Amino acid sequence: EGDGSAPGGSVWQTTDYIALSMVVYRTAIKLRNFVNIRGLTPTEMIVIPWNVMRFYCEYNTGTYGLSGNVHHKNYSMLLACKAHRPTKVGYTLSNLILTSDELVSTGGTLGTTTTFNTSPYMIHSIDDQQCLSKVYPKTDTVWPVSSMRELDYVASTVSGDNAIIPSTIFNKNRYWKQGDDALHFSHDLDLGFWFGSDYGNAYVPQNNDSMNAVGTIPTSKHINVRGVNNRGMAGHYLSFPPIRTNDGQFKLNAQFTLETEIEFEFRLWEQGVQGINSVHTNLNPANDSLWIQSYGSLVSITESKINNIQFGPTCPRVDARNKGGKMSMLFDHH
Amino acid sequence: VGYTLSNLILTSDELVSTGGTLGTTTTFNTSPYMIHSIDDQQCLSKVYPKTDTVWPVSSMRELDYVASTVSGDNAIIPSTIFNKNRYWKQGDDALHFSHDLDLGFWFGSDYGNAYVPQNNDSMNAVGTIPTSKHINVRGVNNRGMAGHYLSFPPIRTNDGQFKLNAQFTLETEIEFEFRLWEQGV
Amino acid sequence: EGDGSAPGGSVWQTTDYIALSMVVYRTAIKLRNFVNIRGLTPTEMIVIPWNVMRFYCEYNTGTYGLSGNVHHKNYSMLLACKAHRPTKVGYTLSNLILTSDELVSTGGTLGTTTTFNTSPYMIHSIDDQQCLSKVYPKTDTVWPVSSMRELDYVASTVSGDNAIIPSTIFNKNRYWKQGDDALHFSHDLDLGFWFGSDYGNAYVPQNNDSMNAVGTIPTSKHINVRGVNNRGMAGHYLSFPPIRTNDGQFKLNAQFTLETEIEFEFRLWEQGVQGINSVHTNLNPANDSLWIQSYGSLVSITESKINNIQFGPTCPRVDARNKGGKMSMLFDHH
Amino acid sequence: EGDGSAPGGSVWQTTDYIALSMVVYRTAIKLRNFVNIRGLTPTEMIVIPWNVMRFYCEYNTGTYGLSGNVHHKNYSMLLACKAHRPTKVGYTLSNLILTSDELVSTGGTLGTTTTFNTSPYMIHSIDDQQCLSKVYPKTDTVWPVSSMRELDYVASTVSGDNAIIPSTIFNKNRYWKQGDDALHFSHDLDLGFWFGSDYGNAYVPQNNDSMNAVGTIPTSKHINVRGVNNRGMAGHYLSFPPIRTNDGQFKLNAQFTLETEIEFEFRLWEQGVQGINSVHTNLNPANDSLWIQSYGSLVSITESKINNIQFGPTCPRVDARNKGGKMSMLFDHH
Ligand SMILES: [Ca+2]
Ligand SMILES: [Ca+2]
Ligand SMILES: [Ca+2]
């Protein structure tokens, strides 16, 4: 009888500190942008940097990326809590506006204007078969990270002597016209672990031939969280259909709104004296390293400029038993 | 109180040049749109005219009032910060906006360039300073109106930005209750 | 038909940024402590600093309070999110151990030991009628804030010529013996508003004769959140029954465990470009001041030492229509 | 098992001192009077001082008001208990007797006598629309407070050049004849608070344009009981219909009995040592000021004589949501 505080019977025991340390809180970062794609020939193609973490949670448009600390403030506090995990990520292309430079000439006096009819389209390509494993900027151009969210990144897909029309090689190609419904693209992440640091121009976690989701080198004589199972994202791209003119190719320009959303889960500090700031340094659990794992693989950045983008999708020809849910396993290292 | 935007007509100055001989005309296709923004989160608390321009009150109902929303070094695209953004094209149904006022009191004077009554961080609905040693009607509860705005999507051209011009009809309606004088002598 | 993106019909409109800014996340800070109450005569009384915010979320025991930044780490991040609110607050006294100095003498050779039988008790007093509005330390002693959670704060309640036995004036007096069940005390806060700053040795919000829950001076020609309705906390106290001896009073010493819990709600940053760090300074809503309100009333602290503690409970003789749930109202100031 | 006094289990706790401090005791003061209204022309009008507290609980008639301490003894002890509240208040006019001076002349030999037939009447006017906000005595006369309960107070309601017949402007006008049933008038007070002092020629509590129910100036940095909602009393009046004669106006004189009743609630002292006379001075709760509030607004008295009477009724054109029950709210002051 009683709560146990009596001399005999059951032991009075203190309240549970786990329950509040395991509660998963779930937030998101939503951002809108206007994208203007101009002067894109049918060979060259816009690379959607949609597999890089910085695309969703940091707003790089125009002058913003030049100014400092453009991260969304929900993300700045995800570094205040002890663990965060990116979970689902996605974006939306909406309200396409095509314009034409066909009336434009060096003499001027006539500017670009929307296409005379709505038959033209912009091709949204998803490369499932990974025709392009690794994508580089065009010879003259370069990819700024400050420019990331307005989609200027132009790749020229070229065989040895052959200029590749991107829509022809890629698997899913959506021909998206003026008036069509918005194009919604999403990726679900199921991670068995959490991140304690900032992404820092890392790809949003993927398990692929190109990259793995967990970023820490596992170390000897204990168990470490290890990536497994091949979850990855398909290399999205934007291109225009080749249309021949009296001279060269038809000039198609596109506008659309870019709505990106990344949904973070985060988790808070240990209850009790363990969570006191002064004593948490040396009372921090050493098994954080077990479930808290940093970021796996970084985009290649020299200066502020992206060197290349790797995609590596969950390829359909991997055994379906490998392609399943959980992206990490807790496995030892000798 | 409320208003309606209806029968949008977009035109383009793209064919217009200083040499002339070609005037503006309706957009070649109906894909362009005018963005109607309602700021729910109050990104903009207080709005000022552009540096060169000014806002006449005599001009109020034809909507010329132009604000330039700018961060420190950053020019803000209005549609990106605001909460509800309607992209309203040619042929779309009219846009109806309304605000219901529930006041516990009445007004005896003219509004006289007053905001239609609101309870907010910026303003309160009742205008008289209450005075000592008795009971006075006091604003309460935060009823306010969202900062509606109109803007066009950025569209790059060979030079600068695409020139979008808009026409629409503005139907406003304000519904007054009124009350008459005391009976008797 | 469609999502609205077509030329005619309904307006395609962007995603809602409110839903994620209104989501209320709910955490707590739990801390345990051992309290040793010694040399407390029947006139003097231990003041439970249970109505001060710093009691629950900052751990002041022994050497900890001398060391820097002893706040719990869940609270340090409540300053990272834009709004937090304290909601429920409470504490538990458990596993009482009484000891006696009766065998102790200046000659020594015999130390204190647990009471020969379990008949003695420690009195837990809740002052409902507010016999003591404002409580001061004893003439010689002083109340450190670094000492807060181990309960050393001793008040001597005295009439003009009369030494008050605390248990006699106070309303609820629990005589709590060795083996009795733990004593659980809780206070629910219903606030209509949120806090954007640190409590900073503020009383956990109360509406009373002594103090109000909202801390900002309201300013002219607009509406401001105003405290209302008298929610307050009863002045908890600890004392021992007077027991006469051959010389003076029986020496009762007490041990018990102090488990405090404070449950915070918090709320995150605005979605969209409004929530970008660089532009959030000047795009911060000016109506934050409407629902975000700081801390109302501070304990009186000179140096590190508490000058006095005010209690001000929700008194039972206030009309029950005043005593109800919501602690704030949004009311204008002229 | 047991009452808790055992070593283990539940805490034996002392009896509740709230229950007896919250018990509301309810009394009343009833007084009868004979009113003689003579020489009242149709322009001038009797002001019923029925909204002043002293009307009901202090008996001012003839020589009584000249003698000292004419308060009813139930009221003298309402100052012995710690709190009292006026609640309902009302009065009755009964058994009207009209007489005529028409047969009276300066030569005499014929005195006044009851009207030849019962057709004449005395007009009881209730001003709902507040035609008269503030009422003054006639130029020559003055209003003694010692004369209050026999109704001599004569106002002359006059426009700029126009003598107002009172019955014409006022809303409810009862033409009350000889033999008509008694006229009963009542006002219910719902206060959220109590009074600790004497009324002291205060209006019985009202919330109006002219006056408020709570009399203490609220003070900084805590919560204070504040009047709210517009409960007030209509300016009752007595007048006679204009009846022209061969010379001037018909002389109507009235008698009736005035039965007034005021129903007080009162509340007693704190139980326990807190309620001991010697220690109650410094153990008095400081939150009395929260629910104990004095008197709001005073009639204007120079010497013993009333300067003016303010009425301020619950006007019907205030929103019905404002006009509801509770006359006070517990609201903070910064
Ligand atoms: Ca046990
Ligand atoms: Ca449409
Ligand atoms: Ca027991």
JSON list of N, CA, C and O in Angstrom, two decimals, chain C residues 118 129-131 171 173-175 177-178 180-181 208-209 214 226-229 316-317 321-322, chain D residues 5 7 9 11-14 18 21-22 190 222-223 267 270 274 286-287 326 330 332 334:
[
{"chain": "C", "resi": 118, "resn": "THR", "atom": "N", "xyz": [8.91, 6.92, 14.98]},
{"chain": "C", "resi": 118, "resn": "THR", "atom": "CA", "xyz": [8.46, 7.67, 13.81]},
{"chain": "C", "resi": 118, "resn": "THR", "atom": "C", "xyz": [7.36, 8.67, 14.14]},
{"chain": "C", "resi": 118, "resn": "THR", "atom": "O", "xyz": [6.81, 9.28, 13.22]},
{"chain": "C", "resi": 129, "resn": "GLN", "atom": "N", "xyz": [-4.90, 31.79, 3.22]},
{"chain": "C", "resi": 129, "resn": "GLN", "atom": "CA", "xyz": [-5.47, 33.07, 3.61]},
{"chain": "C", "resi": 129, "resn": "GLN", "atom": "C", "xyz": [-4.44, 34.18, 3.56]},
{"chain": "C", "resi": 129, "resn": "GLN", "atom": "O", "xyz": [-4.78, 35.33, 3.86]},
{"chain": "C", "resi": 130, "resn": "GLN", "atom": "N", "xyz": [-3.20, 33.86, 3.20]},
{"chain": "C", "resi": 130, "resn": "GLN", "atom": "CA", "xyz": [-2.11, 34.82, 3.12]},
{"chain": "C", "resi": 130, "resn": "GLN", "atom": "C", "xyz": [-1.91, 35.52, 4.46]},
{"chain": "C", "resi": 130, "resn": "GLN", "atom": "O", "xyz": [-1.96, 36.74, 4.57]},
{"chain": "C", "resi": 131, "resn": "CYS", "atom": "N", "xyz": [-1.72, 34.71, 5.50]},
{"chain": "C", "resi": 131, "resn": "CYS", "atom": "CA", "xyz": [-1.26, 35.26, 6.77]},
{"chain": "C", "resi": 131, "resn": "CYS", "atom": "C", "xyz": [0.02, 36.05, 6.56]},
{"chain": "C", "resi": 131, "resn": "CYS", "atom": "O", "xyz": [0.20, 37.13, 7.13]},
{"chain": "C", "resi": 171, "resn": "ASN", "atom": "N", "xyz": [-3.28, 27.78, 6.85]},
{"chain": "C", "resi": 171, "resn": "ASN", "atom": "CA", "xyz": [-4.55, 27.09, 6.62]},
{"chain": "C", "resi": 171, "resn": "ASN", "atom": "C", "xyz": [-4.35, 25.59, 6.48]},
{"chain": "C", "resi": 171, "resn": "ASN", "atom": "O", "xyz": [-4.73, 24.82, 7.37]},
{"chain": "C", "resi": 173, "resn": "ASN", "atom": "N", "xyz": [-2.11, 22.58, 6.80]},
{"chain": "C", "resi": 173, "resn": "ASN", "atom": "CA", "xyz": [-0.89, 22.14, 7.47]},
{"chain": "C", "resi": 173, "resn": "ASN", "atom": "C", "xyz": [-0.89, 20.62, 7.43]},
{"chain": "C", "resi": 173, "resn": "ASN", "atom": "O", "xyz": [-1.73, 19.98, 8.06]},
{"chain": "C", "resi": 174, "resn": "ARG", "atom": "N", "xyz": [0.06, 20.06, 6.71]},
{"chain": "C", "resi": 174, "resn": "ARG", "atom": "CA", "xyz": [0.23, 18.62, 6.61]},
{"chain": "C", "resi": 174, "resn": "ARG", "atom": "C", "xyz": [1.32, 18.19, 7.57]},
{"chain": "C", "resi": 174, "resn": "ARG", "atom": "O", "xyz": [2.45, 18.69, 7.48]},
{"chain": "C", "resi": 175, "resn": "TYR", "atom": "N", "xyz": [1.00, 17.29, 8.48]},
{"chain": "C", "resi": 175, "resn": "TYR", "atom": "CA", "xyz": [2.02, 16.75, 9.37]},
{"chain": "C", "resi": 175, "resn": "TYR", "atom": "C", "xyz": [2.54, 15.49, 8.71]},
{"chain": "C", "resi": 175, "resn": "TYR", "atom": "O", "xyz": [1.87, 14.46, 8.71]},
{"chain": "C", "resi": 177, "resn": "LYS", "atom": "N", "xyz": [5.21, 12.52, 8.22]},
{"chain": "C", "resi": 177, "resn": "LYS", "atom": "CA", "xyz": [6.07, 11.70, 9.05]},
{"chain": "C", "resi": 177, "resn": "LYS", "atom": "C", "xyz": [6.98, 10.84, 8.19]},
{"chain": "C", "resi": 177, "resn": "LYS", "atom": "O", "xyz": [6.96, 10.89, 6.96]},
{"chain": "C", "resi": 178, "resn": "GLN", "atom": "N", "xyz": [7.78, 10.03, 8.85]},
{"chain": "C", "resi": 178, "resn": "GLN", "atom": "CA", "xyz": [8.65, 9.09, 8.19]},
{"chain": "C", "resi": 178, "resn": "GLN", "atom": "C", "xyz": [7.82, 7.91, 7.71]},
{"chain": "C", "resi": 178, "resn": "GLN", "atom": "O", "xyz": [7.16, 7.24, 8.51]},
{"chain": "C", "resi": 180, "resn": "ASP", "atom": "N", "xyz": [5.41, 8.30, 5.34]},
{"chain": "C", "resi": 180, "resn": "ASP", "atom": "CA", "xyz": [4.26, 8.84, 4.63]},
{"chain": "C", "resi": 180, "resn": "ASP", "atom": "C", "xyz": [4.56, 8.95, 3.14]},
{"chain": "C", "resi": 180, "resn": "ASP", "atom": "O", "xyz": [5.71, 9.02, 2.71]},
{"chain": "C", "resi": 181, "resn": "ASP", "atom": "N", "xyz": [3.49, 8.96, 2.36]},
{"chain": "C", "resi": 181, "resn": "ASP", "atom": "CA", "xyz": [3.63, 9.08, 0.92]},
{"chain": "C", "resi": 181, "resn": "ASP", "atom": "C", "xyz": [4.19, 10.45, 0.57]},
{"chain": "C", "resi": 181, "resn": "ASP", "atom": "O", "xyz": [4.12, 11.40, 1.35]},
{"chain": "C", "resi": 208, "resn": "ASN", "atom": "N", "xyz": [-1.84, 38.95, -8.72]},
{"chain": "C", "resi": 208, "resn": "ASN", "atom": "CA", "xyz": [-2.11, 39.05, -7.30]},
{"chain": "C", "resi": 208, "resn": "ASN", "atom": "C", "xyz": [-2.10, 40.50, -6.85]},
{"chain": "C", "resi": 208, "resn": "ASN", "atom": "O", "xyz": [-1.85, 41.42, -7.63]},
{"chain": "C", "resi": 209, "resn": "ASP", "atom": "N", "xyz": [-2.37, 40.68, -5.57]},
{"chain": "C", "resi": 209, "resn": "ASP", "atom": "CA", "xyz": [-2.13, 41.96, -4.92]},
{"chain": "C", "resi": 209, "resn": "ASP", "atom": "C", "xyz": [-0.66, 42.34, -4.97]},
{"chain": "C", "resi": 209, "resn": "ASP", "atom": "O", "xyz": [-0.32, 43.52, -5.02]},
{"chain": "C", "resi": 214, "resn": "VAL", "atom": "N", "xyz": [2.14, 39.80, -16.49]},
{"chain": "C", "resi": 214, "resn": "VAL", "atom": "CA", "xyz": [2.69, 40.39, -17.70]},
{"chain": "C", "resi": 214, "resn": "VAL", "atom": "C", "xyz": [3.59, 41.55, -17.31]},
{"chain": "C", "resi": 214, "resn": "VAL", "atom": "O", "xyz": [3.24, 42.35, -16.44]},
{"chain": "C", "resi": 226, "resn": "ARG", "atom": "N", "xyz": [-3.03, 42.44, -21.01]},
{"chain": "C", "resi": 226, "resn": "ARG", "atom": "CA", "xyz": [-3.14, 42.91, -19.65]},
{"chain": "C", "resi": 226, "resn": "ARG", "atom": "C", "xyz": [-3.49, 41.74, -18.76]},
{"chain": "C", "resi": 226, "resn": "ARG", "atom": "O", "xyz": [-4.34, 40.92, -19.11]},
{"chain": "C", "resi": 227, "resn": "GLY", "atom": "N", "xyz": [-2.84, 41.65, -17.61]},
{"chain": "C", "resi": 227, "resn": "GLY", "atom": "CA", "xyz": [-3.18, 40.61, -16.66]},
{"chain": "C", "resi": 227, "resn": "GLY", "atom": "C", "xyz": [-4.58, 40.79, -16.10]},
{"chain": "C", "resi": 227, "resn": "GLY", "atom": "O", "xyz": [-5.09, 41.90, -15.99]},
{"chain": "C", "resi": 228, "resn": "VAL", "atom": "N", "xyz": [-5.22, 39.67, -15.77]},
{"chain": "C", "resi": 228, "resn": "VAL", "atom": "CA", "xyz": [-6.58, 39.69, -15.26]},
{"chain": "C", "resi": 228, "resn": "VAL", "atom": "C", "xyz": [-6.78, 38.43, -14.43]},
{"chain": "C", "resi": 228, "resn": "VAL", "atom": "O", "xyz": [-6.05, 37.45, -14.57]},
{"chain": "C", "resi": 229, "resn": "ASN", "atom": "N", "xyz": [-7.75, 38.47, -13.52]},
{"chain": "C", "resi": 229, "resn": "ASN", "atom": "CA", "xyz": [-8.40, 37.33, -12.86]},
{"chain": "C", "resi": 229, "resn": "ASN", "atom": "C", "xyz": [-7.78, 36.71, -11.61]},
{"chain": "C", "resi": 229, "resn": "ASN", "atom": "O", "xyz": [-8.38, 35.78, -11.09]},
{"chain": "C", "resi": 316, "resn": "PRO", "atom": "N", "xyz": [-9.43, 32.56, -1.76]},
{"chain": "C", "resi": 316, "resn": "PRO", "atom": "CA", "xyz": [-10.76, 31.98, -1.87]},
{"chain": "C", "resi": 316, "resn": "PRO", "atom": "C", "xyz": [-11.88, 32.98, -1.69]},
{"chain": "C", "resi": 316, "resn": "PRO", "atom": "O", "xyz": [-13.01, 32.69, -2.09]},
{"chain": "C", "resi": 317, "resn": "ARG", "atom": "N", "xyz": [-11.61, 34.13, -1.10]},
{"chain": "C", "resi": 317, "resn": "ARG", "atom": "CA", "xyz": [-12.67, 35.11, -0.88]},
{"chain": "C", "resi": 317, "resn": "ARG", "atom": "C", "xyz": [-12.85, 36.08, -2.03]},
{"chain": "C", "resi": 317, "resn": "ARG", "atom": "O", "xyz": [-13.80, 36.86, -2.01]},
{"chain": "C", "resi": 321, "resn": "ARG", "atom": "N", "xyz": [-16.07, 34.22, -9.91]},
{"chain": "C", "resi": 321, "resn": "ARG", "atom": "CA", "xyz": [-16.11, 34.65, -11.30]},
{"chain": "C", "resi": 321, "resn": "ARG", "atom": "C", "xyz": [-14.83, 35.35, -11.70]},
{"chain": "C", "resi": 321, "resn": "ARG", "atom": "O", "xyz": [-14.48, 35.37, -12.88]},
{"chain": "C", "resi": 322, "resn": "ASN", "atom": "N", "xyz": [-14.12, 35.93, -10.74]},
{"chain": "C", "resi": 322, "resn": "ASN", "atom": "CA", "xyz": [-12.81, 36.51, -11.02]},
{"chain": "C", "resi": 322, "resn": "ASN", "atom": "C", "xyz": [-11.72, 35.46, -11.08]},
{"chain": "C", "resi": 322, "resn": "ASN", "atom": "O", "xyz": [-10.77, 35.63, -11.84]},
{"chain": "D", "resi": 5, "resn": "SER", "atom": "N", "xyz": [-2.84, 10.00, 10.96]},
{"chain": "D", "resi": 5, "resn": "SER", "atom": "CA", "xyz": [-1.92, 10.23, 12.07]},
{"chain": "D", "resi": 5, "resn": "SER", "atom": "C", "xyz": [-0.84, 9.18, 12.24]},
{"chain": "D", "resi": 5, "resn": "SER", "atom": "O", "xyz": [0.08, 9.38, 13.01]},
{"chain": "D", "resi": 7, "resn": "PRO", "atom": "N", "xyz": [2.38, 6.54, 11.23]},
{"chain": "D", "resi": 7, "resn": "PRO", "atom": "CA", "xyz": [3.65, 6.85, 10.60]},
{"chain": "D", "resi": 7, "resn": "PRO", "atom": "C", "xyz": [3.66, 6.79, 9.07]},
{"chain": "D", "resi": 7, "resn": "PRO", "atom": "O", "xyz": [4.31, 7.62, 8.49]},
{"chain": "D", "resi": 9, "resn": "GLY", "atom": "N", "xyz": [1.75, 6.37, 4.97]},
{"chain": "D", "resi": 9, "resn": "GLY", "atom": "CA", "xyz": [0.54, 6.62, 4.20]},
{"chain": "D", "resi": 9, "resn": "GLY", "atom": "C", "xyz": [0.22, 8.08, 3.96]},
{"chain": "D", "resi": 9, "resn": "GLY", "atom": "O", "xyz": [1.08, 8.82, 3.53]},
{"chain": "D", "resi": 11, "resn": "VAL", "atom": "N", "xyz": [-0.98, 12.08, 4.88]},
{"chain": "D", "resi": 11, "resn": "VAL", "atom": "CA", "xyz": [-0.64, 13.12, 5.84]},
{"chain": "D", "resi": 11, "resn": "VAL", "atom": "C", "xyz": [-1.83, 13.58, 6.65]},
{"chain": "D", "resi": 11, "resn": "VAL", "atom": "O", "xyz": [-2.87, 13.87, 6.10]},
{"chain": "D", "resi": 12, "resn": "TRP", "atom": "N", "xyz": [-1.69, 13.58, 7.97]},
{"chain": "D", "resi": 12, "resn": "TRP", "atom": "CA", "xyz": [-2.76, 14.08, 8.80]},
{"chain": "D", "resi": 12, "resn": "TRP", "atom": "C", "xyz": [-2.69, 15.57, 8.59]},
{"chain": "D", "resi": 12, "resn": "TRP", "atom": "O", "xyz": [-1.63, 16.15, 8.73]},
{"chain": "D", "resi": 13, "resn": "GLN", "atom": "N", "xyz": [-3.80, 16.19, 8.25]},
{"chain": "D", "resi": 13, "resn": "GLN", "atom": "CA", "xyz": [-3.77, 17.62, 8.01]},
{"chain": "D", "resi": 13, "resn": "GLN", "atom": "C", "xyz": [-4.87, 18.31, 8.80]},
{"chain": "D", "resi": 13, "resn": "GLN", "atom": "O", "xyz": [-5.91, 17.73, 9.09]},
{"chain": "D", "resi": 14, "resn": "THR", "atom": "N", "xyz": [-4.60, 19.56, 9.15]},
{"chain": "D", "resi": 14, "resn": "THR", "atom": "CA", "xyz": [-5.44, 20.34, 10.04]},
{"chain": "D", "resi": 14, "resn": "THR", "atom": "C", "xyz": [-6.72, 20.78, 9.34]},
{"chain": "D", "resi": 14, "resn": "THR", "atom": "O", "xyz": [-6.83, 20.76, 8.11]},
{"chain": "D", "resi": 18, "resn": "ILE", "atom": "N", "xyz": [-10.78, 28.12, 5.55]},
{"chain": "D", "resi": 18, "resn": "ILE", "atom": "CA", "xyz": [-11.43, 28.91, 4.52]},
{"chain": "D", "resi": 18, "resn": "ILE", "atom": "C", "xyz": [-12.94, 28.88, 4.69]},
{"chain": "D", "resi": 18, "resn": "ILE", "atom": "O", "xyz": [-13.60, 29.92, 4.67]},
{"chain": "D", "resi": 21, "resn": "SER", "atom": "N", "xyz": [-14.50, 31.48, 6.62]},
{"chain": "D", "resi": 21, "resn": "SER", "atom": "CA", "xyz": [-14.24, 32.85, 6.20]},
{"chain": "D", "resi": 21, "resn": "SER", "atom": "C", "xyz": [-15.00, 33.23, 4.94]},
{"chain": "D", "resi": 21, "resn": "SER", "atom": "O", "xyz": [-15.20, 34.42, 4.69]},
{"chain": "D", "resi": 22, "resn": "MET", "atom": "N", "xyz": [-15.42, 32.25, 4.15]},
{"chain": "D", "resi": 22, "resn": "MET", "atom": "CA", "xyz": [-16.16, 32.52, 2.93]},
{"chain": "D", "resi": 22, "resn": "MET", "atom": "C", "xyz": [-17.67, 32.53, 3.10]},
{"chain": "D", "resi": 22, "resn": "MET", "atom": "O", "xyz": [-18.37, 32.90, 2.16]},
{"chain": "D", "resi": 190, "resn": "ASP", "atom": "N", "xyz": [-25.11, 43.32, -8.34]},
{"chain": "D", "resi": 190, "resn": "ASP", "atom": "CA", "xyz": [-24.19, 42.20, -8.37]},
{"chain": "D", "resi": 190, "resn": "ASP", "atom": "C", "xyz": [-22.78, 42.77, -8.42]},
{"chain": "D", "resi": 190, "resn": "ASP", "atom": "O", "xyz": [-22.35, 43.26, -9.46]},
{"chain": "D", "resi": 222, "resn": "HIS", "atom": "N", "xyz": [0.40, 45.44, -9.92]},
{"chain": "D", "resi": 222, "resn": "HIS", "atom": "CA", "xyz": [-0.38, 44.32, -9.42]},
{"chain": "D", "resi": 222, "resn": "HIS", "atom": "C", "xyz": [-1.81, 44.47, -9.93]},
{"chain": "D", "resi": 222, "resn": "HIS", "atom": "O", "xyz": [-2.13, 45.42, -10.66]},
{"chain": "D", "resi": 223, "resn": "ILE", "atom": "N", "xyz": [-2.66, 43.54, -9.52]},
{"chain": "D", "resi": 223, "resn": "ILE", "atom": "CA", "xyz": [-4.01, 43.43, -10.03]},
{"chain": "D", "resi": 223, "resn": "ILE", "atom": "C", "xyz": [-4.96, 44.09, -9.04]},
{"chain": "D", "resi": 223, "resn": "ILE", "atom": "O", "xyz": [-4.76, 44.01, -7.82]},
{"chain": "D", "resi": 267, "resn": "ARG", "atom": "N", "xyz": [-19.69, 39.36, 5.74]},
{"chain": "D", "resi": 267, "resn": "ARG", "atom": "CA", "xyz": [-18.76, 38.25, 5.78]},
{"chain": "D", "resi": 267, "resn": "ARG", "atom": "C", "xyz": [-17.83, 38.45, 6.97]},
{"chain": "D", "resi": 267, "resn": "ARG", "atom": "O", "xyz": [-17.49, 39.58, 7.30]},
{"chain": "D", "resi": 270, "resn": "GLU", "atom": "N", "xyz": [-11.26, 36.00, 9.54]},
{"chain": "D", "resi": 270, "resn": "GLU", "atom": "CA", "xyz": [-10.52, 34.78, 9.26]},
{"chain": "D", "resi": 270, "resn": "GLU", "atom": "C", "xyz": [-10.47, 33.88, 10.49]},
{"chain": "D", "resi": 270, "resn": "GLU", "atom": "O", "xyz": [-10.27, 34.35, 11.61]},
{"chain": "D", "resi": 274, "resn": "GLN", "atom": "N", "xyz": [-4.99, 33.76, 12.88]},
{"chain": "D", "resi": 274, "resn": "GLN", "atom": "CA", "xyz": [-5.03, 34.93, 12.01]},
{"chain": "D", "resi": 274, "resn": "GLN", "atom": "C", "xyz": [-6.13, 35.90, 12.43]},
{"chain": "D", "resi": 274, "resn": "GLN", "atom": "O", "xyz": [-5.98, 37.11, 12.25]},
{"chain": "D", "resi": 286, "resn": "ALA", "atom": "N", "xyz": [-2.89, 40.81, 2.98]},
{"chain": "D", "resi": 286, "resn": "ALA", "atom": "CA", "xyz": [-2.70, 41.93, 2.08]},
{"chain": "D", "resi": 286, "resn": "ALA", "atom": "C", "xyz": [-3.55, 41.82, 0.84]},
{"chain": "D", "resi": 286, "resn": "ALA", "atom": "O", "xyz": [-3.66, 42.80, 0.09]},
{"chain": "D", "resi": 287, "resn": "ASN", "atom": "N", "xyz": [-4.17, 40.67, 0.60]},
{"chain": "D", "resi": 287, "resn": "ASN", "atom": "CA", "xyz": [-5.06, 40.50, -0.53]},
{"chain": "D", "resi": 287, "resn": "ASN", "atom": "C", "xyz": [-6.50, 40.84, -0.19]},
{"chain": "D", "resi": 287, "resn": "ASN", "atom": "O", "xyz": [-7.39, 40.58, -1.00]},
{"chain": "D", "resi": 326, "resn": "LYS", "atom": "N", "xyz": [-22.13, 41.19, -13.70]},
{"chain": "D", "resi": 326, "resn": "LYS", "atom": "CA", "xyz": [-21.07, 41.42, -12.72]},
{"chain": "D", "resi": 326, "resn": "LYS", "atom": "C", "xyz": [-20.52, 42.84, -12.83]},
{"chain": "D", "resi": 326, "resn": "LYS", "atom": "O", "xyz": [-20.08, 43.25, -13.90]},
{"chain": "D", "resi": 330, "resn": "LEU", "atom": "N", "xyz": [-11.35, 41.88, -11.98]},
{"chain": "D", "resi": 330, "resn": "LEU", "atom": "CA", "xyz": [-10.08, 41.92, -11.28]},
{"chain": "D", "resi": 330, "resn": "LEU", "atom": "C", "xyz": [-9.01, 42.07, -12.35]},
{"chain": "D", "resi": 330, "resn": "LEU", "atom": "O", "xyz": [-8.75, 41.14, -13.11]},
{"chain": "D", "resi": 332, "resn": "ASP", "atom": "N", "xyz": [-5.32, 44.16, -13.69]},
{"chain": "D", "resi": 332, "resn": "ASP", "atom": "CA", "xyz": [-4.05, 44.77, -13.29]},
{"chain": "D", "resi": 332, "resn": "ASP", "atom": "C", "xyz": [-3.84, 46.22, -13.66]},
{"chain": "D", "resi": 332, "resn": "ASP", "atom": "O", "xyz": [-4.49, 46.76, -14.54]},
{"chain": "D", "resi": 334, "resn": "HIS", "atom": "N", "xyz": [-0.59, 49.01, -14.37]},
{"chain": "D", "resi": 334, "resn": "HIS", "atom": "CA", "xyz": [0.84, 49.15, -14.57]},
{"chain": "D", "resi": 334, "resn": "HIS", "atom": "C", "xyz": [1.33, 50.55, -14.18]},
{"chain": "D", "resi": 334, "resn": "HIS", "atom": "O", "xyz": [1.44, 51.43, -15.03]}
]
